[PDB]
């Protein structure tokens, strides 16, 4: 059962190299091309290069010559990708991709695609490094509360944060993060709740940053 | 003539099958030992005597198909090919016989392999892939030799050793001249994959007199 | 060979119909032109492959059509997962182009923000930089502007915002603005104001506290 399987992700700086490589497996015929297509943050899909295993044949996109290389391993039925010199904007999702022939009627066959799972690549001058956490406050009586948690300064992604240990999901907000200029990153999640329930409702949220090991369960109480 | 060929093909479990209808050296055969390791040498057989009479993995030689009928051209992938024991190949027609021409897209379209063994007949089997990938085959009908046992051999090919009367002309049910010989075709490394590394013969066979000059691929 | 899709977002309501394009700057070689589902966090999906084949799995509410330059990708009845970004691609060629997607996002009535500011605790103040977050909460459509004012100096240049995707439950958005000052700033000025402009809201909000009280 055909599956491409791609290494894991990686953090490099900048001016570095990185090999990705994607391992066929599955076939009982195997396929003849592989492309690597990526994919930056916010932008769009990008096809970067094509190799023929058996002649060792490779056809790069411009925008990456000069940068790329694909290169084989027949016997292992594995692909790589190198990218060199790499610099912030190189931040993205990589995927080998190969085509084979699905189905065919009257006489013409139809190619289809399958995809390797992705292989994330960060470039980012930063180190590791685990968030300050600080509480939003709420600021009613009969009506409806925000409270929350700011999780600043962390690096790599991701965080997970939760509100009393799992129990509170509904209405819970956890913001995509944002870059700041210094390379770490910022997030906030918040809460909505009853007026009525501040002072009185425990109000944890549980962050956990794996990258570093951090682990904070932040009281976030009205301010005095 | 070309347009003749069912191909009514389609991958659906994801084998890259299909791959191998136009290019080459392309097969995995790691999982060839545990498949092979199915199919049992005619040593292991039991003897068989008296009169003979007539009665899945068809990478086996010892595979006992059915006698050959017609099927509907929506099941076949790539071309049909029977043995006499020339390899000849078997296109689409109607249900009346009539060769048609639109690569089996009908459903009325059928192969007609019904078979008599020559030499009163057509040919000895047929081979070929249905629509997702597995290789089918029907012939003969295969040869009750007797004998005693659980390991009874139902013989589709030459089994002499087992029975001094099981030859090829009396047996033969497709491509297997032999327990380690198969009729060489173009689609061969196609419908028994695993027989990628056997070794071509020229060989020579008779028929009722008729003499058959063929590759036989051995092990 | 560039393909352009249109439109470019498409708003609608579940069990109802949407029909996005593909126009290609030349033809396609074999219709070799696949669509895909782009979700968030997710890898792309292929759903359509040689212009008109589903892939396995993919329901029959989608459907996929054209040749040579124009391509169709069609979607019967709208549920709830079908909403997302939606890209296509040609491969006739060694050399593959995307087109740039296409969003497809829940249409629901207009449904204004709440919002709430939220003061830099003193923890963070004791490190010596100041967040201020505004926090625009469940609201539709997506269009929104925040603007901070400090002594009623609209501000610039620093604040980062960043927006949920859309709410499986009820179909909105949620929105967060963090401006970040030094302690020393921050000690500068008095009044923090955010200013919320958005459709459901007959003028714009602020909401807002003096440092210190
Ligand atoms: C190409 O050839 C392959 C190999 O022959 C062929 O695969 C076989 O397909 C049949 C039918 O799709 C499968 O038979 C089924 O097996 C399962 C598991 O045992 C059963 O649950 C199924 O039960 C059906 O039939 C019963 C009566 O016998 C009913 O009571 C029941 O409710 C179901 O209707 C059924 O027997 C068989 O397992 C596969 N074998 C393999 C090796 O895959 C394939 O279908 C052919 N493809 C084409 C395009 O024809
Ligand atoms: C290549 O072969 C593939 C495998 O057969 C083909 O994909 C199959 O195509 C058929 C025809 O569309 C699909 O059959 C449909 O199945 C759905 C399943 O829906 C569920 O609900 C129904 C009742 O509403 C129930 O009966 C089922 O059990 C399901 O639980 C039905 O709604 C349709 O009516 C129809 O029966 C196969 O499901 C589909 N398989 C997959 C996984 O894609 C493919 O079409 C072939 N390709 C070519 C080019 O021919
Ligand atoms: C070549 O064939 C072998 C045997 O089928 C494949 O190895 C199998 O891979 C599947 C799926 O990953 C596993 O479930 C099996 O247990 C594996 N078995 C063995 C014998 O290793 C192998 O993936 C195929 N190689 C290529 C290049 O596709
Ligand atoms: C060729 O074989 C087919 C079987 O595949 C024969 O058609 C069958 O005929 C019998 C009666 O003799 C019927 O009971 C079956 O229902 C038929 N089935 C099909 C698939 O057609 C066909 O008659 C044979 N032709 C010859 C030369 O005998
Ligand atoms: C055929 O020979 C090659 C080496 O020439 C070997 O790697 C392969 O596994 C062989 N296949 C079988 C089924 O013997």
């Known amino acids: 059962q055909v599956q491409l399987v791609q290494s894991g992700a990686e953090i490099k700086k900048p001016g570095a190299s990185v090999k990705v490589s994607c391992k066929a497996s599955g076939y009982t015929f195997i396929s003849n091309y592989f492309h690597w297509v990526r994919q930056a943050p916010g932008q769009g899909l990008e096809w970067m290069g094509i190799?023929?295993?058996?002649?060792?044949?490779?056809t790069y996109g411009q925008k990456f010559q000069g940068r790329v290389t694909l290169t084989s391993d027949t016997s292992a039925s594995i692909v790589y990708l190198e990218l060199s010199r790499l610099r912030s904007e190189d931040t993205a999702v990589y995927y080998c991709v190969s085509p084979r022939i699905a189905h065919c009627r009257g006489g013409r066959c139809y190619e289809t695609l399958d995809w390797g799972q992705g292989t994330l690549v960060t470039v980012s001058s930063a180190s590791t490094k685990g968030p300050s956490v600080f509480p939003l406050a709420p600021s009613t009586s009969g009506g409806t509360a925000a409270l929350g948690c700011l999780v600043k300064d962390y690096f790599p992604e991701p965080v997970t944060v939760s509100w009393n240990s799992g129990a509170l999901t509904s209405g819970v907000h956890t913001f995509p993060a944002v870059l700041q200029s210094s390379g770490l990153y910022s997030l906030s999640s918040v809460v909505t709740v009853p007026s009525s329930s501040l002072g009185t409702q425990t109000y944890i949220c549980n962050v956990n940053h794996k990258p570093s090991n951090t682990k904070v369960d932040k009281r976030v109480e009205p301010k005095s | 003539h070309i347009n003749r060929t069912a191909l009514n093909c389609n991958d659906s479990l994801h084998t890259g099958f299909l791959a191998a209808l136009f290019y080459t050296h392309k097969f995995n055969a790691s999982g060839c030992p545990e498949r092979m390791a199915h199919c049992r040498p005619i040593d292991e057989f039991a003897q068989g005597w008296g009169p003979i009479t007539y009665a899945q993995r068809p990478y086996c030689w010892h595979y006992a198909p059915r006698q050959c009928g017609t099927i509907p051209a929506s099941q076949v992938c790539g071309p049909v090919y029977c043995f006499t024991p020339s390899p000849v190949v078997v296109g689409t027609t109607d249900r009346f016989g009539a060769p048609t021409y639109t690569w089996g897209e009908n459903e009325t379209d059928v192969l007609i392999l019904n078979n008599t063994r020559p030499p009163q007949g057509n040919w000895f089997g047929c081979t070929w892939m249905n629509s997702t990938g597995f290789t089918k085959t029907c012939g003969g009908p295969p040869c009750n030799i007797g004998g005693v046992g659980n390991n009874t051999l139902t013989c589709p090919t030459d089994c002499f050793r087992k029975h001094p009367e099981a030859t090829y002309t009396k047996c033969g049910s497709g491509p297997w001249l032999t327990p380690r010989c198969l009729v060489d075709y173009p689609y061969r490394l196609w419908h028994y994959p695993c027989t990628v590394n056997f070794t071509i013969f020229k060989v020579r066979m008779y028929v009722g007199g008729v003499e058959h000059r063929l590759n036989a691929a051995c092990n | 060979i560039v393909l352009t899709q249109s439109p470019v977002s498409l708003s609608l309501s579940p069990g109802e119909r949407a029909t996005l394009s593909c126009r290609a700057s030349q033809s396609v070689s074999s219709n070799y032109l696949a669509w895909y589902q782009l979700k968030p966090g997710r890898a792309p999906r292929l759903l359509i492959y040689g212009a008109s084949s589903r892939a396995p799995g993919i329901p029959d509410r989608f459907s996929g059509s054209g040749s040579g330059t124009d391509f169709t990708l069609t979607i019967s009845r709208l549920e709830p997962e079908d909403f997302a970004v939606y890209y296509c691609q040609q491969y006739g060629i060694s050399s593959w182009t995307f087109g740039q997607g296409t969003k497809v996002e829940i249409k629901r009535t207009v449904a204004a923000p709440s919002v709430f500011i939220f003061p830099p605790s003193d923890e963070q103040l004791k490190s010596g930089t100041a967040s201020v977050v505004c926090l625009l909460n469940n609201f539709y459509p997506r269009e929104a502007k925040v603007q901070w004012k400090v002594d009623n100096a609209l501000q610039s240049g620093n604040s980062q915002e960043s927006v949920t995707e859309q709410d499986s439950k009820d179909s909105t958005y949620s929105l967060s603005s963090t401006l970040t000052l030094s302690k020393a700033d921050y000690e500068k000025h008095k009044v923090y104001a955010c200013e919320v402009t958005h459709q459901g809201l007959s003028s714009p909000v602020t909401k807002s506290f003096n440092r210190g009280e």
């Open positions: 190799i023929n295993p058996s002649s060792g044949s490779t």
